[PDB]
Amino acid sequence: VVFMNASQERTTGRQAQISNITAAKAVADVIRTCLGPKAMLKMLLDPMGGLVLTNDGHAILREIDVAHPAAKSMLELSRTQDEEVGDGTTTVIILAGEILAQCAPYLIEKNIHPVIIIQALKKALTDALEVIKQVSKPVDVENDAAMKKLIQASIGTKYVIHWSEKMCELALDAVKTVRKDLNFEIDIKRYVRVEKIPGGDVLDSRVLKGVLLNKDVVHPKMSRHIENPRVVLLDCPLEYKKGESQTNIEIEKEEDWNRILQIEEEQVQLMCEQILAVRPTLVITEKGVSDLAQHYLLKGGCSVLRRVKKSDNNRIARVTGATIVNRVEDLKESDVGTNCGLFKVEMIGDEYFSFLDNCGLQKACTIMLRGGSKDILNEIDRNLQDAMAVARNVMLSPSLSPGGGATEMAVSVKLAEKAKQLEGIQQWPYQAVADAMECIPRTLIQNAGGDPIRLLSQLRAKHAQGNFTTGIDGDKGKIVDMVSYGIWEPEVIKQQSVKTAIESACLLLRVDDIVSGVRK
Amino acid sequence: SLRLPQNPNAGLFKQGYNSYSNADGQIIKSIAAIRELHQMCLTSMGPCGRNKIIVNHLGKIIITNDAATMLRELDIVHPAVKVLVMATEQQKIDMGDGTNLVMILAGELLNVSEKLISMGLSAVEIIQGYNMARKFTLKELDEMVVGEITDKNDKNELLKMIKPVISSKKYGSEDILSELVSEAVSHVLPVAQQAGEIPYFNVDSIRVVKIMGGSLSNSTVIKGMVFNREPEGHVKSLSEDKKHKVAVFTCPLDIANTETKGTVLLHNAQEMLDFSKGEEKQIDAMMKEIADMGVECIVAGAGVGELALHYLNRYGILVLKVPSKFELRRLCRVCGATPLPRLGAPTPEELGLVETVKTMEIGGDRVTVFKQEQGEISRTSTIILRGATQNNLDDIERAIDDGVAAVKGLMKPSGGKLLPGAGATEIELISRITKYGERTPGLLQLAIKQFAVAFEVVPRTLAETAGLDVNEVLPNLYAAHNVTEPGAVKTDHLYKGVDIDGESDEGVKDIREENIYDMLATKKFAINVATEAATTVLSIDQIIMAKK
Amino acid sequence: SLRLPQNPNAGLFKQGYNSYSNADGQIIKSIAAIRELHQMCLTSMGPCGRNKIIVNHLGKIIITNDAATMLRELDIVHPAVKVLVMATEQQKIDMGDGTNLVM
Amino acid sequence: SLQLLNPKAESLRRDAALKVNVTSAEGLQSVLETNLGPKGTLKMLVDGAGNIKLTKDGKVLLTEMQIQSPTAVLIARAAAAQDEITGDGTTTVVCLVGELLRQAHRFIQEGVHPRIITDGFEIARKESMKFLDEFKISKTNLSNDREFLLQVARSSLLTKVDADLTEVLTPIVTDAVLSVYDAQADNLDLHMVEIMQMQHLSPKDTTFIKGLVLDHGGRHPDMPTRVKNAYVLILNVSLEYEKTEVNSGFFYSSADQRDKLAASERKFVDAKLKKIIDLKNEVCGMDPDKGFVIINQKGIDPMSLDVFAKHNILALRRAKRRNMERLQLVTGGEAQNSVEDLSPQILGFSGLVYQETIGEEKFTYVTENTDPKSCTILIKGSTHYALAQTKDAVRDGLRAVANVLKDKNIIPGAGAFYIALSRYLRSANMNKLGAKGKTKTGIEAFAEALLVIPKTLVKNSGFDPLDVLAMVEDELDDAQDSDETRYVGVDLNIGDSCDPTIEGIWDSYRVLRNAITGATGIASNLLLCDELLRAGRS
Amino acid sequence: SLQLLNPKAESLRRDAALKVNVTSAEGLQSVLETNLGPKGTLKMLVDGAGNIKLTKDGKVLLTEMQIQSPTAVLIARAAAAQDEITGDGTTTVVCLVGELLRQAHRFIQEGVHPRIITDGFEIARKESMKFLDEFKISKTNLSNDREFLLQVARS
Amino acid sequence: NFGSQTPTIVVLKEGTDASQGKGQIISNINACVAVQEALKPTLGPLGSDILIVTSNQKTTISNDGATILKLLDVVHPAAKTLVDISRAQDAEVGDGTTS
Amino acid sequence: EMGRPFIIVKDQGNKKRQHGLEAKKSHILAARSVASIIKT
């Protein structure tokens, strides 16, 4: 009989709660060294063999296979922070892992029901958002000098802090190019193109507005340098089109077979004449190009590029202003790309690269990153995406919040004053969030080599004086305020980190049993 | 990229050797490993504690709630847990009391240490915090002591000592188990008041005989020792009274044999005819001198030949077999006899006195009654224990030994030194150490304040095992200790304690009427061993194991 | 003292790779290895030379004293022999005479 | 705490992973350090198939040998990227990465945190880039002198083969450019030269050709092998149809139409051949010594070979894709797809066209051009590895002479640039610090690590590197007070110093610039990685 | 050339053997690196029989735990014999041997011959003996100072 | 630190059962009721008997609660308590072991 | 079963139990097989 074939034996009670808390703490313990400007790096080995070396929180979690079912929920929390914002994925797990670590001596000790704690976690979440809103100050979103210091917040942890002066100029013009007036700037990462070119120097880089293609020219005579280029996008291949009806031709007369090949040559010449009506200087298609259509376009000087990526065509239409039309009969002068210039093909031994420079507000840009190695170049790509994500929330809302240990401790002080005034059953779980916000500033000291005992003891005494700007230095570990050094981070990063940790803590505390063997 | 370097230069040691250090959360895993066996003993604490079943490899089942006994049959793996296992065994041997307290207290010191380590406190500063707080703890125990046992033996006073100790082990009925143990203690006491002699007591004097069947109410106290034996020649009720004269021989009764090459030598038929009747006259001449002294019973320590048992039945002398040693050693302490190896006539001054020897059916077999009477008092009395199951008979035997060990605590120190029970001892120390933590400047106050937090497990365990909410009951108890002391003396608020079930809401008024108290000599070593047990775990930065 | 350290470089490259370097072997050692096949060609040289029977895995037997033909059908694991084998292959392809002299 | 997540997951934290990065880089360097210099060792790569490859370059060695250690994979991918752009510096980067880790690992055991160690690397590297501008010497490439290009090209060949074959290949790699230049446009492409693999003569008997050489021979016997005047007609259309796009068939009512339907396919073939024959006689008729040659990228109908055989026309089929662009540069013609538009202006010109039969294949030779814009290099060898060993020596020599035209600045070689950085990075004074005692630790580790390059050269020659560099520091001390600028090199012959400018040894600009920057990032990330973790689903 | 002498044998020489003595002594010193000093770590040994050995002495760590590496066997026998006669110096010799191999290993990679390196060790050690006479402080036992024996015992 | 495995220490030796949760004490109740199921039809003068054959092929027919539990070997810890009360009742009074 | 092995008596699966009408039918047929042998 066996009754249930899936986990007929059951683990329930405090045994299931310990397994959920212990596994959740192990997720945050490995990334404790990944927080701070002195943070170390972690290398990951996939079954495919590709090596990924980064200090990012999300990149470490998603590439590690965790056999513990409840600990897998910790792996997907960084995806919520990465997809919505992209910055602060490390602080989410450290905070969420500390909550369950602090909430452990309740069900075992105080015997408090989880829902009773959940009701306290929701009330502490509302008060935490108010403290973050009070400590946040608005700044000018149109100031270019002010946005450069804001991007350096996430760069100070990353290895690109040496190039931070150069990296801020790369990320600033990238977000400003793709944004447009409409939900405000509605910027999207899909419009920003980051191309990875092995070799070169990181100090030498430039923001290029256009699409960088690795495809070579289809014919040697094609001019690789055009003063006034004209781009016309065509989804239809220049090769002879065959009907899907599987038409079978019965040839009887001797002149029927010779005429079929001639008509195939006449239509290819006819399709070129429809293109030459507007006389484009450049031709770009996403499919293959026949050798017959190449000669007919040599007289008009039409440079043809074949097998272009589908998503790249939409990015060409933004910079060049051209309209994608599949049939050659609807081609008009309005559909031809305009305002495009500086078309040149640079000769590099690895691949042939094509450049585009722009002179309907949506635009695009291609950032050329030159690293020392292919794997380091993959790190700068990830560091550039997180750098541009910081400028997104700054342009969405003017609100700007402190960081580096000031915001986390500012909430814990406000939670200590209200805790003594509750005088009820919810007083114990309400104090768990106050001690949970201390892990982030304590981790910054442990990674800096300082003494967390004496620094955090005097740190709480400073916040009682009425100033919320007191942080923790990452290098010297000084108690000096963050206004002097200038650490500031968008409020959305602080909000998404607290909201995710509270919603995740309530999920694992409600699991009283773990069963397997279902095999759906 | 496909395979890791797998820790190069690891061939320095065998593959079975593993290295575990305080770093990488292993010191947290060691504390978490304690909580696995810690919760096992939490449900076993108090009079409402739950006994546990442990099956060994041989199939023997021992059902007990004692932490020291349960950890004996269990196979321990983690090294630091053996520190906690061997710590509870020492408390059971030394004082015979407070075994469950050492198991729980040493486990809670590591639980509160997890928060201390997370804050950055070094292992050196944590050890110094517990050592300075323990010295202040031992000094406050002598200040809070109330009452004394005074006289050695009393009918009422022995109910304030053994009874609260046996209340946690097999609670059941109160006065039934207390009277059985308190009776056997008064017999082994030399008394002799006003003589100024040094009192003496033996924990192995009182013996518990396990006999299945019957009921607990049918148990009694026997002044003599009880064994399962079958008389050889005859059974005698000995109704002729006038007591008896008894002798004990540690050597067997038989013709003395040469230790080397004992052999019968007969040269001629003349020596063969007198060889059969010669051995009969040897035992006759030796046993006649014993019968002339009025000895009606002889205790033997080994096998007795049939030729020797013949003349013993002629004069009506009982025969007793006492195998091994310790069984025969405690027999002479009852009658006050001195064994001698020879088979000759014993010294009249070395003969014992036993008035009656009876053989009756108790558990289905013949047992011999050594019970003494009012006069000619005897020592090392035994307690007949009747029960339906043998599993209950094992722990009650250890429960009586806990009361016997409590009598030993009335000898070495100056007195009994009763302490408030029902967890009131560990609760009062919380408010005193809290004030002590503030009086000490520096960073050492973190470990001192958390040292008093570990004492909160005693009121929470008694409240949780009683079916009461620890959130409602525990804060209501601090209301008596939050009012400190008034402008007038004679403050009885120190008697407040935790109540089991009933009406809850604190209760039992002052425990002075309940008569349940604690021993001061027990709490001294219970805190010291439990502190050193948790200190040893915290003092080990790196743990190395072999073969696994 | 029972087990060797296995060297740290054991994890580097793979266990299937074998290394012969200066002072590590070769150095007139591997030169003594080709002497077995060198003596094979010495007996086949001249008008009195001895032919050699070679049976390929396919079963075809080729009996000749030509070093270029014999070394072609033989499967040789020793790499440095192929340097001498490929040296005799050029003699047969281009000039076609003197293959025994080259080896 | 990792096993709680997965039972099969393993990790090494802090110094456990730190010993891996230092050992794995040292083990990989120890194998490739013997290949640095002209006296370096020669490795023989033998796979399971029996292929033999002799090369001293680390690009081919790391590609054929799969690396199991994850630490050395970063060095392999860094040395691979170094060979892509600069075509050189594979062994150099490998020797620098392992040395930067060992020098920095000595300070880690002293209590120095890896964070400040990475600071000393970036500060000292930026100072080396400023010294690189003052140390380099600009040259004038407008004269196009041979002596300057012979010494630079020879320095790269001395690290591949012996001096006998080097003197033969030195003018070849010097001639690898020649007529290919642009003053204004700056575009320089080395993919126009063709690498031919064939066994002929001896590896030292190879020569340079001033015109394109093809591997396809004459398909018909009557086709003249030697042509004095040939007009190259580029045809990208296939004369023989492989298949018809639209499915069709021939249905004949009577047997008389069978030969007619077969002749129906003869009209389309003759239609393309009609305009080709008229193009030959268009220039001049009955003209001896003037031939006509067609080079086709696609296949040519064997039936049509007799059409050109009567007119003595040479035809070539199955040409490479990169061959079409080279026909415009060499022959001076223009690429044509179909035959619909023809003219004498779009036809190329060649002064000599001949074919040679090597083995069972025939190769086409074209030379004697007026202003050829491209050339080729014929690589001949006596064995299988001779083609791969010489090719790796030429391809590494192509990028060396290209950077001379791309960058007029030339940096002396022979370890003169690495020794000069030693004395400059000892004391930075108050210029760039950023911290007290924190930055100077990483700078000292980076300064002493740059001396591994000159010491490795001496170790391969069998001399004492400490005695060679001892006389180098003594010469630099007296040269500063004598008001004379001297560049001290390393001579591996007599075990003494030398002058790289006089001895003829120089190094490329992009090779040394990308080696210092490339090796810095690899060594920095390994010092910043305290844990090596492996996880995944099998 | 050992494969010709024996069918199955294992050997490592020159750079392969140079990494044997340097690396094996590095892992052994790292075990006793945290041992040295009054604030040093405390180690517990638990064998398969159930016995527990808790001490900071490095001699117990070497005798209870087996060592497969033959390099540390020479160090273990040297560190054990140091505690036999002098009652002290078990962890001291291990730190001296393991470090001196690494300090001299950097110059071995530079091309310096090992013999002339070991020859300098004897020259530097003989100076430590001549300096030891002026470094030591004389104490007269005729004073019978109890405080002097207290401070030495607390070391 | 001696190996990349770094095994996780288990508190109890391998092979030990589990406990707590929900239904652990209930498992002991169903063990005694199942043993009671055999002794219920043996109660009363109209009751039946139980045929038990041990591993030695020794035929024994008993309705007595004490003798039935002696034939079978009970490895269940809580079910052995019914064996003690059956042998204790048979030792003194001798009757009522089934009741 | 709740997921844990339930064994009251050693050699659980080895021993079998018969009850009800099937236990009585097996006993009568066992005597009928012996009877028909003796009746002959």
Side-chain angles (χ1 to χ4, degrees), chain B residues 290-311:
Chain B
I290 295 171
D292 290 344
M293 296 297 103
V295 176
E296 296 301 321
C297 183
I298 294 171
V299 176
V304 176
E306 183 67 15
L307 296 175
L309 295 174
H310 181 62
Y311 296 140

Side-chain angles (χ1 to χ4, degrees), chain D residues 2 19 23 26 31 59 73 82 108 131 170 197 237 251 266 281 291 293 319 389 395 417 435 457 465 476:
Chain D
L2 179 63
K19 302 299 182 180
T23 299
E26 183 178 2
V31 176
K59 179 59 165 60
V73 176
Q82 185 64 59
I108 296 170
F131 178 80
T170 300
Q197 294 178 336
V237 63
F251 297 160
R266 297 287 294 172
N281 291 337
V293 176
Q389 185 173 355
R395 297 179 66 250
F417 177 78
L457 296 174
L476 296 175

Side-chain angles (χ1 to χ4, degrees), chain A residues 354-371:
Chain A
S354 178
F355 295 159
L356 295 174
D357 186 4
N358 62 344
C359 57
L361 296 175
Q362 184 63 59
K363 302 299 183 181
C365 56
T366 299
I367 295 171
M368 294 183 287
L369 296 175
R370 294 182 182 175

Side-chain angles (χ1 to χ4, degrees), chain B residues 6-7 10 17-20 33 53 61 77-78 212-214 386 388-390, chain F residues 1-4 6-7 9-13 77 80-81 84-85 88 91-92:
Chain B
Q6 63 180 19
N7 191 31
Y17 296 141
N18 291 336
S19 178
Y20 297 138
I53 294 171
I61 295 170
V77 176
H78 190 279
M212 293 178 70
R386 299 296 298 277
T389 59
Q390 187 174 355
Chain F
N1 191 30
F2 294 160
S4 295
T6 305
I9 296 171
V10 178
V11 176
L12 296 175
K13 184 178 179 180
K80 291 167 62 181
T81 59
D84 291 344
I85 60 173
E92 183 178 2

